[model samples]
Target: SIQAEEWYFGKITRRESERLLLNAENPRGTFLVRESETTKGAYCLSVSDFDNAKGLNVKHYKIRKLDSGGFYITSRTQFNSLQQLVAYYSKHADGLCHRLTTVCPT
Candidate 1:
């Protein structure tokens, strides 16, 4: 049930996430969620973006978990689930490198 969302790629390695993001098939602004390998239990957001100097690039942000029950990229805003988190970032770049354009296809 946790895999209901296509963007939530649980337990995938950081290298795999980068490969997906770097794939030319997916346009800039595409993004996906994955488990944080370095942090074990935590999660991170991976984004595919373009830079003037670097051209196509991938960026990752740690998704912080609340001790009580929520998740957030920036402490000021929190969501009850990853779904809500993705939805919010889709509309606003906020702290992300770019607003999520499309989910990583299955």
Candidate 2:
């Protein structure tokens, strides 16, 4: 469940809202919600199990649709160090991965 102090932005459907609540297992992770200006649905990605002290991370990629479509698992990985994070971001940011569609959004 989402903590009462955490902030949530953007429009999401009933199912999407529920999924977001259910996916919040790690407090250190980041969650982003982006609405499609051209479509009727929204997108959500949860980066989980991140430990700033240990430098370990896990990202849960998910997309929610309003129609009969379902969620998709884009990508997931763990980085051993900051250098590895930079390398992965550099390579995947250019669209090398089939799951990631673009560079870091923001």
Candidate 3:
């Protein structure tokens, strides 16, 4: 069984074996783990009102996959508050789509 604690989430940078520290405002959410030999690239994901409720309050999330292989949020749903989003992420840390090998622990 893959324990949830085996996985983590954070802002990815150009460094090695280092992940951006998660803060109170931004909680970990569903993450996609890529292969370790992948190249670096800029991937952006955004959240918007489902029904166009409040047109101007669109939330924007930017993610970049650095070297050493990692997961990135290509897109996400609009969250009213950062804390709420983080909370949701904590509950579903193991719900992300694992890449490459399907037998690895999440």
Order the candidates by lDDT, highest first — what do you get? 1, 2, 3
**On residues 32-72, what C-alpha lDDT tens digit does candidate 1 reach at each position?**
88889888667989999987898888999999787887888
Using TM-score as the yardstick, the better of models 1 and 2 is 1
RMSD of each: 1.4, 13.8, 15.1
Candidate 1 overall lDDT versus native = 0.84
TM-score of each: 0.90, 0.27, 0.25
Evaluate all candidate structures by whole-model CA lDDT and list the values in order: 0.84, 0.37, 0.30
The candidates, ranked best first by TM-score, are 1, 2, 3
- Candidate 1 segments whose C-alpha is farther than 4 A from its true place: none
Model 3: per-residue Cα lDDT at residue 72: 40
- In the predicted model 2, the residue pairs found to clash are none
Cα miss at 52, model 2 (Å)?
8.2
Q: Model 3 — which ten-residue stretch has the worst lDDT? A: 97-106
lDDT of 2 by residue, 1-106 (tens): 1222123335544345335533334343334334433445444443334344744343433344424433333324544432343345435533222222222222
